[PDB]
Design a protein around this ligand. Structure first.
Ligand SMILES: *[C@@H]1O[C@H](CO)[C@@H](O[C@@H]2O[C@H](CO)[C@@H](O[C@@H]3O[C@H](CO)[C@@H](O)[C@H](O)[C@@H]3O)[C@H](O)[C@H]2NC(C)=O)[C@H](O[C@@H]2O[C@@H](C)[C@@H](O)[C@@H](O)[C@@H]2O)[C@H]1NC(C)=O
Ligand SMILES: [Cu+2]
Ligand SMILES: [Mg+2]
Length: 183
């Protein structure tokens, strides 16, 4: 159980804005759609069944909810999701995935391709084909996994990082969307 902490996922950020009275316009819209309980369950954007079959089980336009109607507020294609500034072509960004319960598993990091439009629902073809980080059981430190990688280098502006956490002792996987701004 968990989600991305840095850059922070939509689901965990909206939780931290308080589901009872959200502060950012995008989270207001998201909580209005999904209701509050989904956001208190920010750590469980999962498919208990995945077994690595992400593209098969998750329809286009439902990447951020992982095809789960419960998390449909995360699929909103808004221009005003709050984004984490991120350098393009750098190896020092402190990536963090907060785990309420650690698991045996690996994390695949994907970024959106050039010419991604935040105003269009996220489709599989909006992401790069290959992950820019794939890491098995990275160090767990103070409740968060610390992950190192090089960000792809010819990027600027509003993008998204999609993190898939596939367990190795279980078919269960977790799915995280993080809004970022390359700069
Ligand atoms: C990201 O990294 C993980 C490993 O940390 C990749 O998963 C592993 O993929 C290996 C092959 O590329 C799998 O091993 C081969 O598996 C079978 C086992 O029966 C053997 O026949 C064969 O000789 C190899 O041993 C390995 O099983 C798999 N590990 C786990 C726990 O699933 C991962 O690959 C991706 O997801 C897996 C589940 C498969 O769908 C892979 O094809 C797929 O590439 C890496 N992800 C990427 C995108 O590269
Ligand atoms: Cu868990
Ligand atoms: Mg690595």
């Amino acid at each position: 159980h968990g989600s991305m902490e840095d850059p922070i996922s939509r689901v965990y950020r909206c939780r931290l804005e308080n589901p009872e009275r959200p502060t950012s316009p995008a989270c207001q819209a998201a909580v209005a759609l999904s209701g509050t309980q989904a956001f208190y369950d920010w750590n469980e954007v999962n498919i208990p069944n995945a077994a690595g079959r992400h593209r098969e089980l998750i329809p286009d336009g439902q990447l951020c909810s992982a095809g789960r109607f419960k998390y449909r507020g995360l699929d909103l294609a808004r221009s005003d999701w709050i984004a984490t500034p991120l350098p393009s072509g750098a190896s020092s960004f402190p990536f963090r995935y907060i785990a309420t319960a650690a698991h045996l598993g690996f994390f695949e990091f994907y970024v959106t391709r050039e010419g991604y439009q935040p105003t269009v629902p996220l489709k599989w073809a909006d992401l790069e084909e290959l992950p820019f980080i794939n890491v098995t059981n990275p160090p767990l430190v103070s409740g968060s996994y610390q992950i190192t990688g090089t960000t792809p280098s010819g990027k600027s502006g509003s993008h998204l990082i999609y993190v898939i956490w596939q367990r190795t002792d279980s078919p269960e996987a977790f799915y995280s969307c993080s809004d970022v701004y390359f700069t």
